[PDB]
């Protein structure tokens, strides 16, 4: 098995290390690939280490942004990513190389996320989405401006699951934005109380925002 | 330079069926290719190497063949853990590199999408700031356009959208969509739309609000 380090949040310019402890076999008889994946995006191989001579290899792409060692006593693989940029926000996992036989990647460690990003912690706004101009009506809650990830939404504190979106949240100009909309029967709202659930462990809060008709 | 080609990168299909996943090589590669699967959340999974070698622990309709230049996966009657994500892998020397990846996805039938649109919230403009928001609900197949409509002219930027991977329950896609501006950006013009291009329709889906109501 290979474990690597936790999440991390990094100022542009700055440098990252992340680790990656492989345990179960003889370190030294293995290369450790490092491979990168930007969210909803594509793997893309970085280069390896060779424990045994500390021998290293790159993606030419990577050469320079990307440094491999490894200290054979701790069983320990590093990378450190140097001057990051927006670019570099991905999710990084270390992979071991197959041996003589035939190569090949096979164990995958967990991955290790990066994000680069100049915001502080910052807690999210929650603005209502009332109809302004039907059987079903749509509403929703729109969460902006807040660092870092994760948000959860719910509405009327999870008794509303049906018919509910919650969408992934983007990273614009440093902050989060994410929306969420859910659609009840037009007989029923406004009668019917529906209130978003928005919680930002990070921040230590939660908000509630009842979705109130227009006002006119 | 070398370069692996994966397509198709989007395949739809039913519990049962029998897909098949292509990787071109540009050059000569031999028997030198791995394909993983990686589920949704998690890190992938070696599946072959060596073109058509299962790795231990890999269910038997999973199936590697081909050599060189020219490469396929087939999945013999699919399961429903058998959805995701699929990649191939040049693994003789450097660079080890990566196919673009296919996005195995379950079929349905056509639906077009449900539109609303939303004007800035009192609370947003308050601090300063005005949003206009357009759901997009519960359409397949996953691919649509959004056009934005500022009076009679297209917004290009403060637009950011976001879409849902395929839902649990009912297997479509959905897509929002939020156009931002300042306040007097917002206040200079009075009508604001959201145009929906889906194939379930020749003619665009058109929603809008004029800010005077």
């Known amino acids: 098995k290979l474990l690597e380090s936790g999440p991390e949040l990094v100022k542009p310019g700055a440098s990252v290390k992340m680790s990656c402890k492989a345990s179960?076999?003889?370190?030294?008889?293995?290369?450790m690939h490092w491979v990168k994946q930007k969210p909803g995006q594509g793997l893309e191989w970085i280069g390896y280490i060779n424990p045994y001579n500390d021998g290293t290899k790159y993606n030419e792409k990577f050469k320079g942004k990307a440094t491999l060692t490894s200290d054979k006593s701790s069983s320990t693989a590093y990378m450190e990513l140097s001057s990051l940029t927006s670019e570099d926000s991905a999710v990084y996992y270390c992979?071991?190389?197959?041996?003589?036989?035939?190569?090949?990647?096979?164990?995958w460690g967990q991955g290790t996320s990066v994000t680069v990003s100049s915001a502080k912690t910052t807690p999210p706004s929650v603005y209502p989405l009332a109809p302004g101009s039907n059987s079903m009506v749509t509403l929703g809650c729109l969460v902006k401006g807040y660092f870092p990830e994760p948000v959860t939404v719910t509405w009327n504190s999870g008794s509303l699951s049906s018919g509910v979106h919650t969408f992934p949240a983007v990273l614009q100009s440093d902050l989060y934005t994410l929306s969420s909309s859910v659609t009840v029967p037009s007989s029923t709202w406004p009668s019917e109380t529906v209130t978003c659930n928005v919680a930002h462990p990070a921040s230590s809060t939660k908000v509630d925002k009842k979705i109130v008709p227009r006002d006119c | 330079e070398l370069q692996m080609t994966q397509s198709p990168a989007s395949l739809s299909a039913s519990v049962g069926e029998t897909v098949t996943i292509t990787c071109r090589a540009s050059?000569?590669?031999?028997?030198?290719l791995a394909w993983y699967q990686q589920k949704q959340g998690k890190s992938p999974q070696l599946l072959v190497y060596?073109?058509?070698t299962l790795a231990e622990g890999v269910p038997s309709r999973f199936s590697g063949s081909g050599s060189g230049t020219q490469f396929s996966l087939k999945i013999n009657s699919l399961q429903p853990e058998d959805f995701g994500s699929y990649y191939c892998?040049?693994?003789?020397?450097?660079?080890?590199?990566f196919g673009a990846g296919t996005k195995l996805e379950l079929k349905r039938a056509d639906a077009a999408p449900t539109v609303s649109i939303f004007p800035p919230s009192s609370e947003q403009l308050t601090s300063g700031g005005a949003s206009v928001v357009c759901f997009l609900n519960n359409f397949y197949p996953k691919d649509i356009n959004v056009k934005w409509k500022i009076d009679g002219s297209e917004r290009q930027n403060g637009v950011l959208n976001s879409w849902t991977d395929q839902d649990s329950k009912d297997s479509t896609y959905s897509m929002s969509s939020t156009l931002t501006l300042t306040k007097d950006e917002y206040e200079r013009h009075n009508s604001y739309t959201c145009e929906a291009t889906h194939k379930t329709s020749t003619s665009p889906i058109v929603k809008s609000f004029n800010r005077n109501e």
């Open positions: 992979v071991r190389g197959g041996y003589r036989p035939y190569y090949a990647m096979d164990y």
């Open positions: 179960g076999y003889t370190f030294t008889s293995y290369v």
């Open positions: 050059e000569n590669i031999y028997s030198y």
């Open positions: 060596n073109a058509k």
């Open positions: 892998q040049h693994h003789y020397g450097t660079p080890l590199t």
